[PDB]
Amino acid sequence: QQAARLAKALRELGQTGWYWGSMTVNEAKEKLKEAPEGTFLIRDSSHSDYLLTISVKTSAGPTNLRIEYQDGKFRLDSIICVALAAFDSVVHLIDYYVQMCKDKHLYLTKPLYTSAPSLQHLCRLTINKCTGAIWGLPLPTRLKDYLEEYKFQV
């Protein structure tokens, strides 16, 4: 189920609207130079050993953090980071850290969209922030299925 999980993860990632594909390291730094702290995007990694990279503005400038995928689990770069949580879903990973800085670790706040999300998707995002009990909502089955397709808050 290893390849099947990565395929599902990449479908979600295409659904995020903040995946910048083949953006170069220099292009990512140029895009985030003046962005607020916490602003982030995901792009392809240029390194042979890694699939993806998170580009994020820190108080010291834009930086890059590669994402490992091993044994069917996603985790942040273990060469840089060391109780590192693992995730079936990489969008879930991002969501996890995003929520983690709404409490108190990795400071991620607002994604950098490639283009304007659809209104449907923004409504889905808003509803996910309010409840996980999508089935209990006064909505038609077709829209619950749509909500079911993307359960994350970012």
């Binding site: 390849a3 990565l6 990449l10 594909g21 392809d44 042979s48 050993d49 699939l51």
Partner: peptide, 11 residues
């Protein structure tokens, strides 16, 4: 993103 599928399949 079939490019990423094949990159993982390679490595």
């Amino acid at each position: 993103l079939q490019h990423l599928m094949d990159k993982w399949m390679a490595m």
